[PDB]
């Protein structure tokens, strides 16, 4: 289609640090992909990011009970929605499926875990190889799970026993797999 | 440590809107504008929390009225298209006669309009697939996820049509 | 519990 498009985006961000101890709130308005007006709980009032949001900042900050409402958003909005989903979001724990297999270089498939905090470590015989820690990086499956392939570049010689160790906040002890 | 984002948008002249909550990159839920219903990313979520989707439709109503004012402010300057970056992948190691599912991950694009189909052996396959809504980004572009369960002679392509693309982008995955 | 949405404010006209 030839006719042009016009995009308006609004994002209400709640940033948490050490749980609900330190909370920062952002009320951001966007045109196409350019922010033009923003409320920040650290600043305390609406400010114009670009020249395009200057009328909104002037008009919104003058509305009755506006400043009192946005300055209380960290309590009525952010800290509230944090406790609503805390049981199945902040405390969601899904244990990882670890698979070791090469296709020489060994690959430690780590699938279906959550959250993204994780550590993978190879062991030649209990030394923890450093040379050859080729990792494909953490990737997000979009279904509240993560996976990551952790390849090792070594020549498996005779009865050498390689160990893929996995450390995740869902477990109490590291998980190990051998080949 | 954690970030919760309530993302909304409206697009003209296509007249399509969307509303969702993001938790550390994953969607908590979205609101289907057509059925005026709240759709949770995981069916289990709806049994632990609730959200009246009526408030989502009112926000979109305001975003539509705001868009014209902003468009009229900017002397009707359009949005410049940005081509997406697809990446197909599987979520488990591939094994014959053992089921799995492909993932066609569209990344870094705008506006949020895509024509995405699954090509098997050159013929489209629409049976058993699943789609997610547009997901927000820090640079305010968008992401998307498509899924296709299958059983691993068959070649599988992910055809992606976007206005920022001169030709429909093909990404192949065969065993 | 129940989720609360921050309402979208009307732009200056």
């Amino acid at each position, epitope marked *: 289609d030839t006719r042009p498009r016009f995009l308006e985006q609004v994002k209400h961000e709640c940033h948490f640090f050490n749980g609900t101890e330190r909370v920062r709130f952002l009320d951001r308005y966007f045109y196409h992909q350019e922010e033009y007006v923003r409320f920040d709980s650290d600043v305390g009032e609406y400010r114009a990011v670009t020249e395009l949001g200057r009328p909104d900042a002037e008009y919104w900050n003058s509305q009755k*009970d506006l400043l009192e409402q946005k300055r209380a958003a960290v309590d*009525t909005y952010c800290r509230h929605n944090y406790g609503v989903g805390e049981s199945f979001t902040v405390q969601r724990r899904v244990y990882p499926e670890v698979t070791v297999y090469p296709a020489n270089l060994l690959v430690c498939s780590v699938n279906g875990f959550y959250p993204g905090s994780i550590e993978v470590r190879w062991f030649r015989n209990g030394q923890e190889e450093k040379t050859g820690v080729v990792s494909t990086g953490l990737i997000q499956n979009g279904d509240w799970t993560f996976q990551t392939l952790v390849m090792l570049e070594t020549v498996p010689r005779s009865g050498e026993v390689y160990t893929c160790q996995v450390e995740h906040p869902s477990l109490t002890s590291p998980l190990t797999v051998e080949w | 440590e954690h970030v919760i984002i309530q993302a909304e948008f409206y697009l003209n002249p296509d007249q399509s809107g969307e509303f969702m909550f993001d938790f550390d990159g994953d969607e908590i839920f979205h609101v289907d504008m057509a059925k005026k219903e709240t759709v949770w990313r995981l069916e289990e979520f709806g049994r632990f929390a609730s959200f009246e989707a009526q408030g989502a439709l009112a926000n979109i109503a305001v975003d539509k009225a705001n868009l014209e004012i902003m468009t009229k402010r900017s002397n009707y300057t359009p949005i410049t298209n940005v081509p997406p970056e697809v990446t197909v992948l599987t979520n488990s190691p591939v094994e014959l006669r053992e089921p799995n599912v492909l993932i066609c991950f569209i990344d870094k694009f705008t506006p949020p309009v895509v024509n995405v189909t699954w090509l098997r052996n050159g013929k489209p396959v629409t049976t058993g697939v699943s789609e997610t809504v547009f997901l927000p980004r820090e640079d305010h572009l968008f992401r998307k996820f498509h899924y296709l369960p299958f059983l691993p002679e068959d070649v599988y392509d992910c055809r992606v049509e976007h206005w920022g693309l001169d030709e429909p982008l093909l990404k192949h995955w065969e065993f | 519990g129940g989720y609360r949405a921050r309402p979208a404010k*009307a732009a200056a006209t």
Partner: T-cell receptor
Amino acid sequence: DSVTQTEGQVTVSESKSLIINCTYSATSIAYPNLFWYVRYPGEGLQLLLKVITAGQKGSSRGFEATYNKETTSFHLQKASVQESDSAVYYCALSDSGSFNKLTFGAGTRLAVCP
Amino acid sequence: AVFQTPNYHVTQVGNEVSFNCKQTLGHDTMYWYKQDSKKLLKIMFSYNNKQLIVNETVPRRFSPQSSDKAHLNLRIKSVEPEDSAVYLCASSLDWGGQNTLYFGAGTRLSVLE
């Protein structure tokens, strides 16, 4: 959704303490907010005080009310009522997880006799 | 403030009446409340940015209208004796339940057979 408060009119001598009972039966309220509205003689409705968090309490004009989610109550108190406090006090209830929609109690009429 | 009109009105059963309200608080959301002969306050309509968001099973008899964010009008075509009440106009910063409602002086309607 219903709100029950002290019925009818209450006559109190000045400098006496006052308690206006109010309980709400949130049966399908995901995020209840509690309100006390007042209408002084010859004027219109205006907010006396409100509480948004389930544990806190709000105060204004010497009045005090504690959002108590355990006994699902929101009683209004004052240690020494003044003759200017004679008015009609309304207990209100809203659901913050929805559009704003106030459910009012029947209202309590206060008469402070000097 | 929140101004509404008229202050008083008396009319026969079956006539038309028009109430008008305006608020100068820059608010996005406005309301109409009915106070029956038993002093029970109950919401009727709620508008947000010229659009209706809350209809508390009000009869089709009632027709609210708003072509501006700061205005909200109410027309009752063919009134009934049950329509005799006090109608309060209110406004809030937005449709969030944690916002204060600012009420007008009210319209006292008397419908007679």
